[PDB]
Design a protein around this ligand. Structure first.
Ligand SMILES: Oc1cc(-c2ccc(-c3nnn[nH]3)cc2)c(-c2ccc(F)cc2)nc1O
Ligand SMILES: [Mg+2]
Ligand SMILES: [Mn+2]
Ligand SMILES: [Mn+2]
Length: 200
């Protein structure tokens, strides 16, 4: 088949909000989404996973954890997760500081991806083109001491998470894996996959 551009793929297969947040992040770190395209695509994927991870997850009127698949449910419900990823450094740390002061949880040394109000812990999400058991150790060895929960997804369906605690129901994580599988397959059809995979 003909080789497509990764730029084209990213803008077509991710929602404009994801793309825009990704572009801003790269710029913030001084990179151009039109040159570092595999990095661009990786950042978009990781962002979407972060969003899908928090999607449809609230804490109910009684203070337990529920699932609502519409936007029409009750405005008294609080989102179970805070989303840290996607914010610029200043705002990201502002949110982390607010969380840390309210709940009294310890301040992480690096920006995490999410905060879980039910479990009362920060979460580091990862998405790897390599073996999850390996990527996990890389992430695990950076955070040093740990209250931060780590959850790794791959494009082939494997997961690994701290202490075998996977946080979410099977159905939610199946959604994420399906999306990753769909991303991988579509890249393959544009002959973008093999290059993307080797670039990590
Ligand atoms: O787990 C995370 C990973 C990334 C990240 C790091 C490296 C790449 C990459 N380099 N080369 N090819 N891909 C992609 C994603 C990030 C992250 C998000 C936005 C950025 F601007 C930079 C890193 N956050 C995270 O939380
Ligand atoms: Mg970041
Ligand atoms: Mn992050
Ligand atoms: Mn992450």
């Amino acid at each position: 088949g003909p080789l497509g551009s990764m730029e084209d793929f990213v803008r077509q297969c991710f929602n404009p909000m994801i793309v825009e947040l990704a572009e801003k992040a790269m710029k913030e770190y001084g990179e151009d989404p039109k040159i570092e395209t595999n990095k661009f695509a990786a950042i978009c994927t990781h962002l979407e996973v972060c969003f899908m991870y928090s999607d449809f997850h609230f804490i109910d009127e009684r203070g337990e954890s529920i699932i609502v698949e519409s936007g029409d449910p009750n405005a008294l419900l609080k989102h179970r997760f805070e989303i840290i990823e996607g914010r610029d450094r200043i705002m990201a740390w502002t949110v982390v500081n607010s969380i840390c002061n309210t709940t009294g949880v310890e301040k992480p040394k690096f920006l995490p991806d999410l905060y879980d109000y039910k479990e009362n812990r920060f979460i580091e999400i990862g998405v790897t083109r390599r073996e999850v058991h390996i990527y996990y150790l890389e992430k695990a060895n950076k955070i040093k001491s740990e209250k931060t929960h780590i959850h790794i997804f791959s494009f082939t369906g494997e997961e690994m998470a701290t202490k075998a605690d996977y946080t979410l129901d099977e159905e939610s994580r199946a959604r994420i894996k399906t999306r990753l599988f769909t991303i991988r397959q579509e890249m393959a059809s544009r002959s973008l996959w093999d290059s993307f995979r080797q670039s990590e």
